[PDB]
Amino acid sequence: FSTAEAAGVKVAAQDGQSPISDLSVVLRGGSRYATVPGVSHILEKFAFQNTVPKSALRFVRELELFGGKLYTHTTREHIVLRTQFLKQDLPYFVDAFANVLKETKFQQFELTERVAPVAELDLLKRESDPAFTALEAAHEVAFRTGLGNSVYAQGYSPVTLEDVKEFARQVYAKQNVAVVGNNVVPADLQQLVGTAFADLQEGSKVTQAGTTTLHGGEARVRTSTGNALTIALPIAEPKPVYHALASFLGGPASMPWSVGASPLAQATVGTHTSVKATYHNYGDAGLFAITIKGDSPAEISQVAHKAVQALKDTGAEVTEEQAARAYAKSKFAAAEAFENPDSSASVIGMELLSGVSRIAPENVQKFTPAELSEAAAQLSASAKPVVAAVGQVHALPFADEL
Amino acid sequence: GKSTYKIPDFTPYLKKDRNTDANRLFSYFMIGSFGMLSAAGAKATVQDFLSNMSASADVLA
Amino acid sequence: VSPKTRTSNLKNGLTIASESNPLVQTATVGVWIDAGSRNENAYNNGTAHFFEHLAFKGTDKRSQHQLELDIENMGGHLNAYTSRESTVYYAKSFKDDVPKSVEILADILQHSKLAESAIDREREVITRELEEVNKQYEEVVFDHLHATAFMNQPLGRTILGPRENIQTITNTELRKFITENYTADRMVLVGAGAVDHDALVELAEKYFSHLPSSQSPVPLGTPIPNFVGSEVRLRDDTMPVAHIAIAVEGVSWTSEDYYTALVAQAIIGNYDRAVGTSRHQGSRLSNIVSENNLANSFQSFSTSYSDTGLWGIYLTSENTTQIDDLVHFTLKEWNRLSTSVSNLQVERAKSQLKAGLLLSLDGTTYVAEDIGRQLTTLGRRVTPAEVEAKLEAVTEHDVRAWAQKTLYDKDIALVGLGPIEGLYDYNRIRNDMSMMRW
Amino acid sequence: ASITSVVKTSELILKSPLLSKIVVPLAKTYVKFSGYRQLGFKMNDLIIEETPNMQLALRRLPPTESYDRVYRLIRATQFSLSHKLATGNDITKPEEDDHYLIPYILDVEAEAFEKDALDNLEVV
Amino acid sequence: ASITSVVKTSELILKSPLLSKIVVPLAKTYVKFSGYRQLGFKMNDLIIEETPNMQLALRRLPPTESYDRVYRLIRATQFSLSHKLATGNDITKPEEDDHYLIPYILDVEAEAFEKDALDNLEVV
Amino acid sequence: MALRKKNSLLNMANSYVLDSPQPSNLNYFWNFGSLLALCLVIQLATGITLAMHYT
Amino acid sequence: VLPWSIGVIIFLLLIITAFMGYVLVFGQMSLWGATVICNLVSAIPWLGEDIVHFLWGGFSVGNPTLQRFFALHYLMPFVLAVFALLHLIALHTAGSSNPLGITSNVDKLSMHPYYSFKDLITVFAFLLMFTLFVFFSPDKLGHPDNYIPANPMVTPASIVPEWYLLPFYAILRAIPDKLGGVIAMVAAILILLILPIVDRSIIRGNAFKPISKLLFGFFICNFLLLGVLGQVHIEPPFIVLGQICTIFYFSYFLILLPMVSTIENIFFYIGSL
Ligand code: HEM
Ligand code: HEM
Ligand SMILES: CCCCCCCCCCCCO[C@@H]1O[C@H](CO)[C@@H](O[C@H]2O[C@H](CO)[C@@H](O)[C@H](O)[C@H]2O)[C@H](O)[C@H]1O
Ligand SMILES: CCCCCCCCCCCCO[C@@H]1O[C@H](CO)[C@@H](O[C@H]2O[C@H](CO)[C@@H](O)[C@H](O)[C@H]2O)[C@H](O)[C@H]1O
Known part of the structure; x- marks a missing residue:
C-alpha cells in the first residue's frame, strides 16, 4: 500500500492482478469518539442515504447496474465504508464517497424509517450470540467511557437527528478521512480523490473526550x-x-x-x-x-x-x-x-x-x-x-x- | 415412523412419466373436453331458452 | 485480468491445478474429489460423512494427538466438507508451510487408521448430530426439499444418513467406500494464493503418486433423476418464523441453459429486510415484498448437479396471515419470466452477473473452491472471458423460452416449516405456476 | 394532479415577470373569495389525503405540526356543523397560511416518481 | 348435557351391583359397535368442544396431550375423507382409550356451577 | 395483498366461494346446499320467463 | 370511485325500471313512448332490427311486449336494491365524505341517534310534498293522453318521455344521425364515469372553489334547460339551442372541468404563498 496525499486526504492503494477492486473510506469516527452513545453506529447506517446529487434509491439502482456491493461497519476506532466493484468503475465509486461526505441530507424521516430500524436489527442479530454480549459488557466495565462506550445504538438511549448531524460535521472532514484502495492503481486513485474530495471541509481531528482509564x-x-x-x-x-x-x-x-x-x-x-x-x-x-x-x-x-x-x-x-x-x-x-x-x-x-x-x-x-x-x-x-x-x-x- | 426425511411410500400412485408433455397433455385434454361440452351445452341452453322471447307461433300466424 | 490457472496431470491421472497471487502471503491447498453421498447405496448411506470424521481421528503414523499437534505447529488450519456430489479436504497455511500441509492431507486420505475404537466413539457424536441439525432451519428445509424432489433416488438421501446405518457402519465399509471412490482420476489437487505450480506438482509426485486409478476412467464431472412434484409440511405453531422453499427441476452444470437459468434467477434476486439497500432493489418481487412487509427475506437459488438441478426460492416470513400473498406474488413474478420479460430485465440481470461471478472470488479459499468446483464438474476452469461471452449470449428470447419449458405450468417441490397454517394446499400453490390471462 | 405538477407550473409562472404580474393578483383574490381562512384552515389542510403518498407525507410531519393540524380540522368541522365562521384569532391571517406540508409531499413524490423512472431503465 | 351430569349418573350405576351387572356389558358392546376406535379416536376426542367451558378445559391440557389430540383428529379426518378405517397400531385399543380430558372439564364445570350457585346466595 | 382480499366487494365473494375454509372430509351429503342454490336459480330463471307469457 | 361507478349503474337501472313501468298502463303515451324508444335499438348496426323484434316479441309493440315489460318491471327494482346495497358496502371502506372535503377520521359521530333523527326531518318534509301531490293534485306530473287507451292507428300530437328523461331526449335530438344520437344519449350518462379522471383538483369538492362553483351552477342550469328543450316542438329556434346546450353539457366533462380544476390548483398554491 503506497501511502500518499491527495488534496489533504491520505490515500493508500496497492495495485493487483484481479478484475475486482475494493475502495474503502476509513473515518476516525468509531465509538470511542462518539459524542452521544450509539452515534457512530447511526452515522455508519446513514452512509449512502439521500445526498443532494443522488438519492439513496438512485444509488442502489445504479450500483446494481455495475454489480457493485456495499459494506459498512463501525468499530471502537473507525467507521469503515467499503465498496467492491470491477476495476474500470473506479471513478463512479470515488464520486459516490465524495457525495456521501460532502452532501448527505440528514433527513428526519430517513432516521426514523430507514436508519434507526436497520441499526436495531443489526444489534439484535449480533446479540443472538451471547459471547458478543459478554465481550461488549467486558469493555464497558474495563473502560467505562471512550473504549467503554457501546459500539452500537441501543433503545434505552435514543440518538437524535441533531446528534448525528453534529457528529457528522466533525467526522466528515479531511482530517478524519482516509481512502484505502485494494487492487486500485495508486496514481489513478490519487488523481480522482484529488478532484472529488477537494471541497471537503478541512475540519479538525476528532478526539476522545477524556483519557483512557482502566477499571476492574x-x-x-x-x-x-x-x-x-x-x-x-x-x-x-x-x-x-x-x-x-x-x-x-x-x-x-x-x-x-x-x-x-x-x-x-x-x-x-x-x-x-x-x-x-x-x-x-x-x-x-x-x-x-x-x-x-x-x-x-x-x-x-x-x-x-x-x-x-x-x-x-x-x-x-x-x-x-x-x-x-x-x-x-x-x-x-x-x-x-x-x-x-x-x-x-x-x-x-x-x-x-x-x-x-x-x-x-x-x-x-x-x-x-x-x-x-x-x-x-x-x-x-x-x-x-x-x-x-x-x-x-x-x-x-x-x-x-x- | 420417526425420520421425516424418509418419504412415505407413494409408489402405488406415482406415474413414471410424470414430467413429460404427454402426461400433462392428457389431463388437459380431459379438462378441455369438459370445457368444450360445457361451452356447447351453455350455447344450446341459452339459445333454446332465450328463443322464448322471439315471436310465438300464434303471433307469427 | 486475473493470473492464468495452470493445470498438470500425474501418471495415475491426478489433476493439479493452481492459481498464484503474489499479493497474498497465505495459501489454500486441498483435494477436491468428484465423489460424495450420492455414491452410497441405501445400506451404506452416511459412510462418506462418517469417513470425514475419521479422517481426523489418526493415521498409521501420527495418532489423533500427534495429528492435532502437527497442524497446530503448522500455524494454519485444515477443513473438510462432504456434499451429495463433492468432497473437499483443504489446508490454509502460510506460504512456506505448504509442503507440510500437502503431506498431512496426503496422509489423512491415503493412510487413515479407521480403528474400531474410533468408529465406536464417533458413532455417538454423529448420532447427536441427528438431533441438532433440527435447529438449522435452512438446512432442514433444503434437506426435505431434496428428499421430496428426488423421492427414493440417491440425490434424495441425506448426507448424515439414517440412525440405523450410523449404528452399523463398519471399518470395512468405510475402507471399501474410499477405495472405490477416492481414485486419482476423480481427484484434483488445488492450490491458490502463494503457491508455485511447479512446486505443487512436485509435492503431488511425492505424496499422491501411489493413488489407485479407477478401472474405467470417465472424465471429471460425469454423472437418471426423475423429479417428483410434491410437498412436505412441517408445521410448528410454536416457531415465530415460517421457512418455505419452492423449487422446480433446474439445470445441470453442463446444461446449455446453465447461464440462462442464472440470469433468470438474478431477475428475481434476493432480499433481506435487515440490509439497508434492500428496499431500493430493482427486482419487482423485492419491491412487492418490501412495500407490503411480506417477508423477512428471500433468496433465489439455482443449484446444479451432474445430471439435474433445483431452481427455486427460499422465503422466510413472520407475516403468518399473509403467507398466501407472499407465495402468490412470488409465483406471479415467476410467471412473468415466461410472459413479460424483455430486454429491460435481461440486460439489467446480465450487468449484475458479469460482476457477481467475479466478485465472489475474493480470497484464496474462494479461489481454491472455484478452481476445485469447476475442475470436478466441468473438467476445466472456465476463463472469465469465456464466461463473459456465455452471459452475453443470453437474450430475452432465451429467458422466455427457458421459463416456458421449465417453470410455466410445471410441478413444484414445496417445503414449509413453522407456522404455515396460511400456506394453501398443493393445488392452489401449483395453480399459481400459470396465468389464466395469458 | 400531483403536488409536484402544481408546484412546477407555479414556479414557471412566478419566474415570468409578465405572467406573475397578471397571475399573482388573481391568485390572491381567488384565495380571499375561496374563504377557507374564515374556517381557520391553512391551504394545505385542504389537500386530499386518502392516497398512499399523502398518508406517508402526513406520517412524516413533525409531532407539533401534526397536533396543530388535527386541531384545525376539528375546529373547522365544528364551524361547519354549526354554520358559523371563525372570528378573531381563529381566522387564518395571510402570514399564518404556511405551506407546512408541501415539502414533505414533494419528497415523497420525488422518490415515487424516481422509482417509476428507474423501473423503466434500459441499459445502453 | 353437562359432563358433570353424565359422570354422576354413571357413578350411581357403577355403585349399584345389580345395575352395573346389566349396564356395564351393554356399554361395552355399545362402544364396540360405535366404531370410533376404528378411526383411531379416543372417546374424549368426540366431545363437543365449541363451548366456553370446553375451550377452557382444552387450554388446560398438558402440551403433550394436546399435541397428541391434534394428531388423532387430523388422522381421523384423513381416514374419513379417504373412506378407510385404521389398521394395526392406528386402531385404539381398549387400554389406550383413556379419559384424558374428563378431569379438566370436571374442574372447569365445578367452578362454573359453584359460581352459579353463589350468584344466588341469600344471607340468612 | 391480492385484489380478491383487498377489495371489499371481491373479498365478500372470496370469503364464501373461494378462500372459505372447509373441513377436508365433507361427504356427498354436503352437496345438497349447492343443489338447492341451483334449484333456486333455475326457478328464478324459468319463473321470470313464465311471468313474461302468463296472464 | 367504486361507490360512484356502481351509482351510475343504479341510475341506468332506475331509468329502465321507470320506462317499463310507464308502458304498463297501456294508454296512448305508454304505447307510443314504447314504440319510439324501442325503435332506437334499430340503430345498432347489422342486428338492430332483429333485436327490436326480439324485444317486442312480434312486429310492433303489443301484448307480448306488455307482458314481458310487466315481468321485468317487477324484477328490476330488486336488482336496483341489490346495487344500492353494493354501493353502500363499497362506500363503507372510506366512509361518507363531508361538505368540507377533508378527513372526518378526526371527529366521528354515531349514525344513531344523530342522523336517524336528522333523517326524520326530511322524511316528514318529503311526506308533506308527497301528500300535496297525491291527495290534492294527483295528475299534475302526468300526461292526459295516458288516460286514452293505446291506439296503434292514431298518433298523439307530441310523443315525449316522462319529465325526468327529457334532458337525455334533448341530447339525442341534437345529433342528426340516428345512431349518433343514440350514442350521444348513452354517452351523456356513461360520461359520469370519467369525472374521477377529468377532475384534476388537489382538493375534494367545491366548497372552497369559487370558479368551480360558478361552472357547476351553469352546468346544472344547462341540464334543466336541456330538460325543457326535450319537450318543445322540433321548431326554430329550439333546434340550434338544443345543439348548443348539448355541446355545453359534454364540454363540462371534457374541457371545462379539466381546465378550471388545473387553474384553481395553481391559484391555491400561488395565492397562499
Ligand atoms: C322457489 C322458487 C319457486 C318455486 C318452488 C316455484 C313453484 C311453482 C310451482 C309448483 C308452480 C306450479 C307449476 C305447474 O304445475 O304448472 C309454479 C307456477 C308458476 N311460477 Fe313458480 N316457483 C318458484 C319461483 C317462481 C318465480 C321466481 C317466478 C317469477 C314470476 C315464478 C313464476 C311462476 C309462474 C308464472 C307460474 C305459473 C305458470 C305455470 O304453471 O307454469 N315462480 N311455480
Ligand atoms: C336507489 C338509489 C340510491 C340509494 C337508495 C342510495 C343511497 C345512498 C345512501 C344511503 C348513501 C349514504 C348517505 C348519503 O350520502 O346520502 C349514499 C351515498 C352515496 N351514493 Fe347513493 N344511493 C342511490 C343512488 C346513487 C346514485 C345514482 C349514485 C351515483 C350516480 C350514488 C352515489 C353515491 C355516492 C358517491 C355516495 C357517497 C357520497 C358521500 O357520502 O360522499 N348513489 N347513497
Ligand atoms: C349473448 C348470447 C347471444 C344471443 C343469443 C341468441 C338468442 C336466440 C338465437 C337463436 C334462437 C333461435 O334460433 C333458432 O333456434 C332454434 C333452436 O332453439 C332452431 O330450430 C331448430 O331446432 C328446433 C328445436 O330444437 C326445431 O323446432 C327446428 O325445426 C330446428 O330448425 C333454429 O335452427 C335456430 O335458428
Ligand atoms: C355465496 C355467494 C358469494 C357472495 C358472497 C355472499 C355475500 C355475503 C357476504 C356479506 C356478509 C359479510 O361476510 C363477511 O365478510 C368478511 C370479509 O368479506 C368475512 O371475513 C373473513 O374473511 C376475511 C378475509 O377473507 C378476514 O378478514 C376475516 O378474518 C374472516 O372472518 C366474514 O367471515 C364474512 O361473514
Missing part, C-alpha cells in the same frame, strides 16, 4: 438466550507479545471434529463449550479477553476455572515447542487479517489516520518462552480483573471466585 469489576447481563462468560484483563501498556499469548492459549480447533492442542481448547474436554482468547490493542490501552460460551452454566463455570489456571500455568513455564507454535499461529493470524478486506482497511486506516506503522505478517516478532511466560504472569497477577457473565447469571462464576 463485574457485569451480569441476565438473558434467556444462551450463556457466556468473558474474563478480561485490561492492559495499560499494550505490547505485541499479547498477540502471541492470545494465539498460544488459543481456544478454537485447527481441524474438524477435534478439540485442539491449545491449553484453552483442552480446558473444554468433556463439555459442549467453546473458548477463544483474544487481544485487543487500542493504542493507549489493551484488553486481553477469554470468552467461553456454552449451553450449561455448570460447564461454563468448570471451564472458567480451568481457563484461569491455564493462564497461571503459562506464567510458570512455556516450552520452546509451544513458543514456536505461538509464533506460527500468530504470523498466520496476522497474514489472514491483512488479507480480509474488512480488517485490512482498518489496519492501513490506522497507519494513515494515526501514525502506527503496520506490522507486516513477515515481520511479526518471535517471542521466547521467557517473554511469553512473563506476559502471562502479569495477566494472572492483575489488580483489575473484569468478568462479564451473560445468561443464567446466578449460576455463572464471579470475579472473586476466579
Whole structure:
C-alpha cells in the first residue's frame, strides 16, 4: 500500500492482478469518539442515504447496474465504508464517497424509517450470540467511557437527528478521512480523490473526550438466550507479545471434529463449550479477553476455572515447542487479517489516520518462552480483573471466585 | 415412523412419466373436453331458452 | 485480468491445478474429489460423512494427538466438507508451510487408521448430530426439499444418513467406500494464493503418486433423476418464523441453459429486510415484498448437479396471515419470466452477473473452491472471458423460452416449516405456476 | 394532479415577470373569495389525503405540526356543523397560511416518481 | 348435557351391583359397535368442544396431550375423507382409550356451577 | 395483498366461494346446499320467463 | 370511485325500471313512448332490427311486449336494491365524505341517534310534498293522453318521455344521425364515469372553489334547460339551442372541468404563498 496525499486526504492503494477492486473510506469516527452513545453506529447506517446529487434509491439502482456491493461497519476506532466493484468503475465509486461526505441530507424521516430500524436489527442479530454480549459488557466495565462506550445504538438511549448531524460535521472532514484502495492503481486513485474530495471541509481531528482509564469489576447481563462468560484483563501498556499469548492459549480447533492442542481448547474436554482468547490493542490501552460460551452454566463455570489456571500455568513455564507454535499461529493470524478486506482497511486506516506503522505478517516478532511466560504472569497477577457473565447469571462464576 | 426425511411410500400412485408433455397433455385434454361440452351445452341452453322471447307461433300466424 | 490457472496431470491421472497471487502471503491447498453421498447405496448411506470424521481421528503414523499437534505447529488450519456430489479436504497455511500441509492431507486420505475404537466413539457424536441439525432451519428445509424432489433416488438421501446405518457402519465399509471412490482420476489437487505450480506438482509426485486409478476412467464431472412434484409440511405453531422453499427441476452444470437459468434467477434476486439497500432493489418481487412487509427475506437459488438441478426460492416470513400473498406474488413474478420479460430485465440481470461471478472470488479459499468446483464438474476452469461471452449470449428470447419449458405450468417441490397454517394446499400453490390471462 | 405538477407550473409562472404580474393578483383574490381562512384552515389542510403518498407525507410531519393540524380540522368541522365562521384569532391571517406540508409531499413524490423512472431503465 | 351430569349418573350405576351387572356389558358392546376406535379416536376426542367451558378445559391440557389430540383428529379426518378405517397400531385399543380430558372439564364445570350457585346466595 | 382480499366487494365473494375454509372430509351429503342454490336459480330463471307469457 | 361507478349503474337501472313501468298502463303515451324508444335499438348496426323484434316479441309493440315489460318491471327494482346495497358496502371502506372535503377520521359521530333523527326531518318534509301531490293534485306530473287507451292507428300530437328523461331526449335530438344520437344519449350518462379522471383538483369538492362553483351552477342550469328543450316542438329556434346546450353539457366533462380544476390548483398554491 503506497501511502500518499491527495488534496489533504491520505490515500493508500496497492495495485493487483484481479478484475475486482475494493475502495474503502476509513473515518476516525468509531465509538470511542462518539459524542452521544450509539452515534457512530447511526452515522455508519446513514452512509449512502439521500445526498443532494443522488438519492439513496438512485444509488442502489445504479450500483446494481455495475454489480457493485456495499459494506459498512463501525468499530471502537473507525467507521469503515467499503465498496467492491470491477476495476474500470473506479471513478463512479470515488464520486459516490465524495457525495456521501460532502452532501448527505440528514433527513428526519430517513432516521426514523430507514436508519434507526436497520441499526436495531443489526444489534439484535449480533446479540443472538451471547459471547458478543459478554465481550461488549467486558469493555464497558474495563473502560467505562471512550473504549467503554457501546459500539452500537441501543433503545434505552435514543440518538437524535441533531446528534448525528453534529457528529457528522466533525467526522466528515479531511482530517478524519482516509481512502484505502485494494487492487486500485495508486496514481489513478490519487488523481480522482484529488478532484472529488477537494471541497471537503478541512475540519479538525476528532478526539476522545477524556483519557483512557482502566477499571476492574463485574457485569451480569441476565438473558434467556444462551450463556457466556468473558474474563478480561485490561492492559495499560499494550505490547505485541499479547498477540502471541492470545494465539498460544488459543481456544478454537485447527481441524474438524477435534478439540485442539491449545491449553484453552483442552480446558473444554468433556463439555459442549467453546473458548477463544483474544487481544485487543487500542493504542493507549489493551484488553486481553477469554470468552467461553456454552449451553450449561455448570460447564461454563468448570471451564472458567480451568481457563484461569491455564493462564497461571503459562506464567510458570512455556516450552520452546509451544513458543514456536505461538509464533506460527500468530504470523498466520496476522497474514489472514491483512488479507480480509474488512480488517485490512482498518489496519492501513490506522497507519494513515494515526501514525502506527503496520506490522507486516513477515515481520511479526518471535517471542521466547521467557517473554511469553512473563506476559502471562502479569495477566494472572492483575489488580483489575473484569468478568462479564451473560445468561443464567446466578449460576455463572464471579470475579472473586476466579 | 420417526425420520421425516424418509418419504412415505407413494409408489402405488406415482406415474413414471410424470414430467413429460404427454402426461400433462392428457389431463388437459380431459379438462378441455369438459370445457368444450360445457361451452356447447351453455350455447344450446341459452339459445333454446332465450328463443322464448322471439315471436310465438300464434303471433307469427 | 486475473493470473492464468495452470493445470498438470500425474501418471495415475491426478489433476493439479493452481492459481498464484503474489499479493497474498497465505495459501489454500486441498483435494477436491468428484465423489460424495450420492455414491452410497441405501445400506451404506452416511459412510462418506462418517469417513470425514475419521479422517481426523489418526493415521498409521501420527495418532489423533500427534495429528492435532502437527497442524497446530503448522500455524494454519485444515477443513473438510462432504456434499451429495463433492468432497473437499483443504489446508490454509502460510506460504512456506505448504509442503507440510500437502503431506498431512496426503496422509489423512491415503493412510487413515479407521480403528474400531474410533468408529465406536464417533458413532455417538454423529448420532447427536441427528438431533441438532433440527435447529438449522435452512438446512432442514433444503434437506426435505431434496428428499421430496428426488423421492427414493440417491440425490434424495441425506448426507448424515439414517440412525440405523450410523449404528452399523463398519471399518470395512468405510475402507471399501474410499477405495472405490477416492481414485486419482476423480481427484484434483488445488492450490491458490502463494503457491508455485511447479512446486505443487512436485509435492503431488511425492505424496499422491501411489493413488489407485479407477478401472474405467470417465472424465471429471460425469454423472437418471426423475423429479417428483410434491410437498412436505412441517408445521410448528410454536416457531415465530415460517421457512418455505419452492423449487422446480433446474439445470445441470453442463446444461446449455446453465447461464440462462442464472440470469433468470438474478431477475428475481434476493432480499433481506435487515440490509439497508434492500428496499431500493430493482427486482419487482423485492419491491412487492418490501412495500407490503411480506417477508423477512428471500433468496433465489439455482443449484446444479451432474445430471439435474433445483431452481427455486427460499422465503422466510413472520407475516403468518399473509403467507398466501407472499407465495402468490412470488409465483406471479415467476410467471412473468415466461410472459413479460424483455430486454429491460435481461440486460439489467446480465450487468449484475458479469460482476457477481467475479466478485465472489475474493480470497484464496474462494479461489481454491472455484478452481476445485469447476475442475470436478466441468473438467476445466472456465476463463472469465469465456464466461463473459456465455452471459452475453443470453437474450430475452432465451429467458422466455427457458421459463416456458421449465417453470410455466410445471410441478413444484414445496417445503414449509413453522407456522404455515396460511400456506394453501398443493393445488392452489401449483395453480399459481400459470396465468389464466395469458 | 400531483403536488409536484402544481408546484412546477407555479414556479414557471412566478419566474415570468409578465405572467406573475397578471397571475399573482388573481391568485390572491381567488384565495380571499375561496374563504377557507374564515374556517381557520391553512391551504394545505385542504389537500386530499386518502392516497398512499399523502398518508406517508402526513406520517412524516413533525409531532407539533401534526397536533396543530388535527386541531384545525376539528375546529373547522365544528364551524361547519354549526354554520358559523371563525372570528378573531381563529381566522387564518395571510402570514399564518404556511405551506407546512408541501415539502414533505414533494419528497415523497420525488422518490415515487424516481422509482417509476428507474423501473423503466434500459441499459445502453 | 353437562359432563358433570353424565359422570354422576354413571357413578350411581357403577355403585349399584345389580345395575352395573346389566349396564356395564351393554356399554361395552355399545362402544364396540360405535366404531370410533376404528378411526383411531379416543372417546374424549368426540366431545363437543365449541363451548366456553370446553375451550377452557382444552387450554388446560398438558402440551403433550394436546399435541397428541391434534394428531388423532387430523388422522381421523384423513381416514374419513379417504373412506378407510385404521389398521394395526392406528386402531385404539381398549387400554389406550383413556379419559384424558374428563378431569379438566370436571374442574372447569365445578367452578362454573359453584359460581352459579353463589350468584344466588341469600344471607340468612 | 391480492385484489380478491383487498377489495371489499371481491373479498365478500372470496370469503364464501373461494378462500372459505372447509373441513377436508365433507361427504356427498354436503352437496345438497349447492343443489338447492341451483334449484333456486333455475326457478328464478324459468319463473321470470313464465311471468313474461302468463296472464 | 367504486361507490360512484356502481351509482351510475343504479341510475341506468332506475331509468329502465321507470320506462317499463310507464308502458304498463297501456294508454296512448305508454304505447307510443314504447314504440319510439324501442325503435332506437334499430340503430345498432347489422342486428338492430332483429333485436327490436326480439324485444317486442312480434312486429310492433303489443301484448307480448306488455307482458314481458310487466315481468321485468317487477324484477328490476330488486336488482336496483341489490346495487344500492353494493354501493353502500363499497362506500363503507372510506366512509361518507363531508361538505368540507377533508378527513372526518378526526371527529366521528354515531349514525344513531344523530342522523336517524336528522333523517326524520326530511322524511316528514318529503311526506308533506308527497301528500300535496297525491291527495290534492294527483295528475299534475302526468300526461292526459295516458288516460286514452293505446291506439296503434292514431298518433298523439307530441310523443315525449316522462319529465325526468327529457334532458337525455334533448341530447339525442341534437345529433342528426340516428345512431349518433343514440350514442350521444348513452354517452351523456356513461360520461359520469370519467369525472374521477377529468377532475384534476388537489382538493375534494367545491366548497372552497369559487370558479368551480360558478361552472357547476351553469352546468346544472344547462341540464334543466336541456330538460325543457326535450319537450318543445322540433321548431326554430329550439333546434340550434338544443345543439348548443348539448355541446355545453359534454364540454363540462371534457374541457371545462379539466381546465378550471388545473387553474384553481395553481391559484391555491400561488395565492397562499
Ligand atoms: C322457489 C322458487 C319457486 C318455486 C318452488 C316455484 C313453484 C311453482 C310451482 C309448483 C308452480 C306450479 C307449476 C305447474 O304445475 O304448472 C309454479 C307456477 C308458476 N311460477 Fe313458480 N316457483 C318458484 C319461483 C317462481 C318465480 C321466481 C317466478 C317469477 C314470476 C315464478 C313464476 C311462476 C309462474 C308464472 C307460474 C305459473 C305458470 C305455470 O304453471 O307454469 N315462480 N311455480
Ligand atoms: C336507489 C338509489 C340510491 C340509494 C337508495 C342510495 C343511497 C345512498 C345512501 C344511503 C348513501 C349514504 C348517505 C348519503 O350520502 O346520502 C349514499 C351515498 C352515496 N351514493 Fe347513493 N344511493 C342511490 C343512488 C346513487 C346514485 C345514482 C349514485 C351515483 C350516480 C350514488 C352515489 C353515491 C355516492 C358517491 C355516495 C357517497 C357520497 C358521500 O357520502 O360522499 N348513489 N347513497
Ligand atoms: C349473448 C348470447 C347471444 C344471443 C343469443 C341468441 C338468442 C336466440 C338465437 C337463436 C334462437 C333461435 O334460433 C333458432 O333456434 C332454434 C333452436 O332453439 C332452431 O330450430 C331448430 O331446432 C328446433 C328445436 O330444437 C326445431 O323446432 C327446428 O325445426 C330446428 O330448425 C333454429 O335452427 C335456430 O335458428
Ligand atoms: C355465496 C355467494 C358469494 C357472495 C358472497 C355472499 C355475500 C355475503 C357476504 C356479506 C356478509 C359479510 O361476510 C363477511 O365478510 C368478511 C370479509 O368479506 C368475512 O371475513 C373473513 O374473511 C376475511 C378475509 O377473507 C378476514 O378478514 C376475516 O378474518 C374472516 O372472518 C366474514 O367471515 C364474512 O361473514
